[PDB]
Amino acid sequence: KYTRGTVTAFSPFDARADAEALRKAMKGMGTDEETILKILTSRNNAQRQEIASAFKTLFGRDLVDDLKSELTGKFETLMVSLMRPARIFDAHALKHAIKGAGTNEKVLTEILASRTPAEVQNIKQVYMQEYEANLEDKITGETSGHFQRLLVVLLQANRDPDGRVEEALVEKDAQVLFRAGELKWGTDEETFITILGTRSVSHLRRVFDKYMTISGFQIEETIDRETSGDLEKLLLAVVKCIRSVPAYFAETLYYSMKGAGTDDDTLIRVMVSRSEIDLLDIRHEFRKNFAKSLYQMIQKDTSGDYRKALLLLCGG
Ligand SMILES: [Ca+2]
Ligand SMILES: [Ca+2]
Ligand SMILES: [Ca+2]
């Protein structure tokens, strides 16, 4: 319950020697895409931030700008995502899932359902600092309904603390989800939003066990994934992050490749975001749950340099 990542600090690290090798790779006609990917997937984000700085000191050019202008396609996206400061990554993804016409409900849900209260608290903050707006005013302007109210509950980064579990309560709560389950998460929404958004994790895992003993089914079993509802999808992402974040992302990754095509926007966002948190645990849930390794699914769904950088990120 000690999460491991797939990317560690490279050594021996020489930011100046790394910046000089990237310049050369990009300098002139064409590009050496392979020196680029070898450096970027074997340096962690802090290190990358230090290569960016060195690069700006030595040539008076911007590394990202240069990647952007030299690279192309998904390889470009991947590399540019690797380069984004970890501190801003989430705030940035949220600015774009929201900005423009429509909304990307998907990023909304993934990030709010999966990040820790501390991580939500940091995001709200970097967002205010960088974009100048209040995260909350925005979500609230793009979404509506119970969907909207559950994201706001989640944005308070206020779930109860893991202490004493009172079984009576565990018991009261199970009886109400049981009932809403039967109702197709159709009503008394206000009540199950209160329960799922605010109770501690230890208290809700207990609730789900209890729930299973009343009904004979697991709470997620009472909601179709593939089909609709934005709130349903958000309820589902919460339930699963409550039991295991790594399992939730393994499954997220699996559905980004199963069937014709790939949701490359999700493949990349996840691979990058969790590369230094729980990407190894995720690879483990994927294999136990999917019967395939992340590596082989990715080998098969992607191609080229985009594919080799992803496989280096992945690790085995
Ligand atoms: Ca060039
Ligand atoms: Ca929008
Ligand atoms: Ca596919």
Q: What's the SSE pattern?
A: HHHHHHHHHHHHHHHHHHH
Give the count of structural domains.
Answer: 4
Radius of gyration: 21 Å
Judged by helices, strands and strand pairing, the structural class is mainly alpha
Gross geometry: elongated
Between the first and last Cα atoms, what is the distance in angstroms?
22 Å
Q: Report the CATH superfamily of the largest domain.
A: Annexin
Q: State the helicity in percent bands.
A: 55-70%
Protein name: Annexin A5
Keywords: Annexin, Calcium, Calcium/phospholipid-binding, Repeat
Function: Collagen-binding protein.
GO molecular function, one term: calcium ion binding
Please give the structural blueprint.
Elements: H1 15-26, H2 33-42, H3 45-59, H4 63-70, H5 73-83, H6 89-98, H7 105-114, H8 117-131, H9 135-142, H10 145-155, H11 167-182, H12 189-198, H13 201-215, H14 230-243, H15 245-255, H16 264-273, H17 279-290, H18 294-301, H19 304-314
Helix pairs in contact: 1-2, 1-3, 2-19, 4-5, 5-16, 5-19, 6-7, 6-8, 7-14, 9-10, 10-12, 10-14, 11-12, 11-13, 14-15, 15-17, 18-19
The chain binds calcium ion (CA) (3 copies).
PDB class: calcium/phospholipid-binding protein
Keywords: calcium/phospholipid-binding protein, CALCIUM-PHOSPHOLIPID-BINDING PROTEIN complex
Assembly: monomeric
